[PDB]
mmCIF file of all heavy atoms in Angstrom:
data_model
loop_
_atom_site.group_PDB
_atom_site.id
_atom_site.type_symbol
_atom_site.label_atom_id
_atom_site.label_comp_id
_atom_site.label_asym_id
_atom_site.label_seq_id
_atom_site.Cartn_x
_atom_site.Cartn_y
_atom_site.Cartn_z
ATOM 1 N N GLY H 60 68.890 123.781 95.568
ATOM 2 C CA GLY H 60 69.428 123.736 94.276
ATOM 3 C C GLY H 60 69.817 122.433 93.706
ATOM 4 O O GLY H 60 69.485 121.396 94.366
ATOM 5 N N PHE H 61 70.423 122.396 92.559
ATOM 6 C CA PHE H 61 70.887 121.163 91.927
ATOM 7 C C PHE H 61 72.184 120.699 92.591
ATOM 8 O O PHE H 61 73.195 121.387 92.574
ATOM 9 C CB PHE H 61 71.100 121.322 90.489
ATOM 10 C CG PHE H 61 71.131 120.021 89.653
ATOM 11 C CD1 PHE H 61 69.961 119.437 89.221
ATOM 12 C CD2 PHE H 61 72.407 119.425 89.402
ATOM 13 C CE1 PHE H 61 70.021 118.245 88.557
ATOM 14 C CE2 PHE H 61 72.395 118.282 88.652
ATOM 15 C CZ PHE H 61 71.260 117.680 88.278
ATOM 16 N N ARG H 62 72.132 119.534 93.226
ATOM 17 C CA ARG H 62 73.284 119.024 94.074
ATOM 18 C C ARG H 62 73.953 117.893 93.277
ATOM 19 O O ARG H 62 73.264 116.937 92.823
ATOM 20 C CB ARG H 62 72.818 118.548 95.473
ATOM 21 C CG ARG H 62 72.303 119.692 96.354
ATOM 22 C CD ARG H 62 71.475 119.159 97.497
ATOM 23 N NE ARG H 62 70.192 118.543 97.083
ATOM 24 C CZ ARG H 62 69.222 118.227 97.947
ATOM 25 N NH1 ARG H 62 69.385 118.390 99.200
ATOM 26 N NH2 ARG H 62 68.158 117.659 97.440
ATOM 27 N N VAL H 63 75.264 117.969 93.208
ATOM 28 C CA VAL H 63 76.128 116.991 92.493
ATOM 29 C C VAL H 63 77.184 116.601 93.409
ATOM 30 O O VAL H 63 77.948 117.410 93.968
ATOM 31 C CB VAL H 63 76.653 117.510 91.235
ATOM 32 C CG1 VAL H 63 77.508 116.427 90.490
ATOM 33 C CG2 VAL H 63 75.546 118.047 90.310
ATOM 34 N N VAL H 64 77.344 115.260 93.704
ATOM 35 C CA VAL H 64 78.302 114.686 94.555
ATOM 36 C C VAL H 64 79.446 113.952 93.813
ATOM 37 O O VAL H 64 79.157 113.236 92.900
ATOM 38 C CB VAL H 64 77.668 113.783 95.653
ATOM 39 C CG1 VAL H 64 78.743 113.008 96.360
ATOM 40 C CG2 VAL H 64 76.878 114.582 96.570
ATOM 41 N N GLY H 65 80.664 114.211 94.131
ATOM 42 C CA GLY H 65 81.823 113.557 93.552
ATOM 43 C C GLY H 65 82.853 113.285 94.650
ATOM 44 O O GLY H 65 82.717 113.725 95.771
ATOM 45 N N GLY H 66 83.971 112.742 94.193
ATOM 46 C CA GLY H 66 85.060 112.369 95.105
ATOM 47 C C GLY H 66 85.276 110.894 95.220
ATOM 48 O O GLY H 66 84.584 110.059 94.551
ATOM 49 N N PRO H 67 86.110 110.466 96.152
ATOM 50 C CA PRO H 67 86.388 109.044 96.325
ATOM 51 C C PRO H 67 85.116 108.321 96.815
ATOM 52 O O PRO H 67 84.945 107.085 96.410
ATOM 53 C CB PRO H 67 87.454 108.957 97.372
ATOM 54 C CG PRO H 67 87.470 110.392 98.021
ATOM 55 C CD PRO H 67 87.027 111.285 96.971
ATOM 56 N N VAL H 68 84.270 108.885 97.674
ATOM 57 C CA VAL H 68 83.052 108.223 98.166
ATOM 58 C C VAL H 68 82.167 107.835 96.977
ATOM 59 O O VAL H 68 81.300 106.945 97.102
ATOM 60 C CB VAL H 68 82.274 109.150 99.036
ATOM 61 C CG1 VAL H 68 83.193 109.624 100.176
ATOM 62 C CG2 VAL H 68 81.728 110.423 98.323
ATOM 63 N N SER H 69 82.375 108.371 95.741
ATOM 64 C CA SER H 69 81.529 108.003 94.612
ATOM 65 C C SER H 69 81.815 106.617 94.071
ATOM 66 O O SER H 69 81.066 106.117 93.239
ATOM 67 C CB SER H 69 81.756 109.039 93.505
ATOM 68 O OG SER H 69 83.028 108.904 92.874
ATOM 69 N N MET H 70 82.860 105.965 94.613
ATOM 70 C CA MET H 70 83.183 104.612 94.134
ATOM 71 C C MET H 70 82.100 103.589 94.597
ATOM 72 O O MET H 70 81.982 102.510 94.054
ATOM 73 C CB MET H 70 84.503 104.120 94.513
ATOM 74 C CG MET H 70 85.135 103.103 93.614
ATOM 75 S SD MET H 70 86.807 102.554 94.034
ATOM 76 C CE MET H 70 86.449 101.582 95.467
ATOM 77 N N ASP H 71 81.308 104.004 95.590
ATOM 78 C CA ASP H 71 80.071 103.239 95.965
ATOM 79 C C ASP H 71 78.875 104.165 95.860
ATOM 80 O O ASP H 71 78.463 104.745 96.884
ATOM 81 C CB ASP H 71 80.198 102.689 97.446
ATOM 82 C CG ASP H 71 79.156 101.662 97.752
ATOM 83 O OD1 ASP H 71 78.012 101.725 97.238
ATOM 84 O OD2 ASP H 71 79.425 100.772 98.587
ATOM 85 N N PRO H 72 78.280 104.297 94.681
ATOM 86 C CA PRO H 72 77.180 105.305 94.516
ATOM 87 C C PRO H 72 75.945 104.841 95.265
ATOM 88 O O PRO H 72 75.184 105.754 95.674
ATOM 89 C CB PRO H 72 76.931 105.246 92.974
ATOM 90 C CG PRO H 72 78.219 104.611 92.369
ATOM 91 C CD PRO H 72 78.710 103.653 93.380
ATOM 92 N N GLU H 73 75.733 103.511 95.510
ATOM 93 C CA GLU H 73 74.573 103.070 96.185
ATOM 94 C C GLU H 73 74.556 103.631 97.636
ATOM 95 O O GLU H 73 73.530 104.050 98.182
ATOM 96 C CB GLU H 73 74.453 101.608 96.212
ATOM 97 C CG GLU H 73 74.140 101.023 94.795
ATOM 98 C CD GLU H 73 75.433 100.773 94.039
ATOM 99 O OE1 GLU H 73 76.520 101.358 94.317
ATOM 100 O OE2 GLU H 73 75.425 99.884 93.118
ATOM 101 N N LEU H 74 75.744 103.578 98.332
ATOM 102 C CA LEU H 74 75.845 104.102 99.683
ATOM 103 C C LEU H 74 75.575 105.622 99.704
ATOM 104 O O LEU H 74 74.853 106.093 100.605
ATOM 105 C CB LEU H 74 77.203 103.809 100.221
ATOM 106 C CG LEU H 74 77.514 104.113 101.670
ATOM 107 C CD1 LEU H 74 76.671 103.222 102.592
ATOM 108 C CD2 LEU H 74 78.978 103.977 102.038
ATOM 109 N N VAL H 75 76.187 106.357 98.761
ATOM 110 C CA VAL H 75 75.918 107.794 98.675
ATOM 111 C C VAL H 75 74.428 108.127 98.561
ATOM 112 O O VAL H 75 73.910 108.975 99.315
ATOM 113 C CB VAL H 75 76.730 108.409 97.489
ATOM 114 C CG1 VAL H 75 76.526 109.924 97.450
ATOM 115 C CG2 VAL H 75 78.215 108.142 97.718
ATOM 116 N N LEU H 76 73.749 107.440 97.569
ATOM 117 C CA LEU H 76 72.348 107.720 97.369
ATOM 118 C C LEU H 76 71.516 107.170 98.540
ATOM 119 O O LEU H 76 70.432 107.691 98.778
ATOM 120 C CB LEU H 76 71.915 107.034 96.075
ATOM 121 C CG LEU H 76 72.532 107.636 94.825
ATOM 122 C CD1 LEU H 76 72.157 106.906 93.608
ATOM 123 C CD2 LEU H 76 72.117 109.102 94.692
ATOM 124 N N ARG H 77 72.029 106.205 99.315
ATOM 125 C CA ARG H 77 71.341 105.784 100.526
ATOM 126 C C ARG H 77 71.384 106.865 101.569
ATOM 127 O O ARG H 77 70.366 107.152 102.256
ATOM 128 C CB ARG H 77 71.922 104.474 101.033
ATOM 129 C CG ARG H 77 71.584 104.120 102.433
ATOM 130 C CD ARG H 77 72.286 102.862 102.923
ATOM 131 N NE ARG H 77 72.104 102.668 104.397
ATOM 132 C CZ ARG H 77 71.096 101.991 104.872
ATOM 133 N NH1 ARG H 77 70.179 101.444 104.121
ATOM 134 N NH2 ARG H 77 71.052 101.854 106.215
ATOM 135 N N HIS H 78 72.527 107.491 101.763
ATOM 136 C CA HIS H 78 72.636 108.539 102.814
ATOM 137 C C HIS H 78 72.315 109.949 102.293
ATOM 138 O O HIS H 78 71.929 110.751 103.149
ATOM 139 C CB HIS H 78 74.068 108.503 103.304
ATOM 140 C CG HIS H 78 74.444 107.308 104.100
ATOM 141 N ND1 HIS H 78 74.069 107.170 105.415
ATOM 142 C CD2 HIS H 78 75.076 106.169 103.796
ATOM 143 C CE1 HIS H 78 74.508 106.020 105.913
ATOM 144 N NE2 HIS H 78 75.110 105.399 104.858
ATOM 145 N N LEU H 79 72.413 110.202 101.058
ATOM 146 C CA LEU H 79 72.198 111.587 100.541
ATOM 147 C C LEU H 79 71.177 111.570 99.379
ATOM 148 O O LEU H 79 71.261 110.819 98.444
ATOM 149 C CB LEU H 79 73.512 112.149 100.062
ATOM 150 C CG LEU H 79 74.693 112.160 101.018
ATOM 151 C CD1 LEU H 79 75.913 112.835 100.346
ATOM 152 C CD2 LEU H 79 74.368 112.903 102.288
ATOM 153 N N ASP H 80 70.231 112.475 99.523
ATOM 154 C CA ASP H 80 69.196 112.710 98.512
ATOM 155 C C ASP H 80 69.720 113.733 97.532
ATOM 156 O O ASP H 80 69.402 114.881 97.596
ATOM 157 C CB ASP H 80 67.825 113.110 99.075
ATOM 158 C CG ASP H 80 66.784 113.384 98.065
ATOM 159 O OD1 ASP H 80 66.580 112.516 97.153
ATOM 160 O OD2 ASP H 80 66.193 114.480 98.079
#
Side-chain angles (χ1 to χ4, degrees):
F61 197 85
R62 292 164 292 190
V63 182
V64 168
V68 307
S69 70
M70 209 178 70
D71 191 331
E73 293 86 339
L74 186 66
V75 178
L76 294 175
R77 163 184 172 89
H78 291 279
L79 304 182
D80 177 53

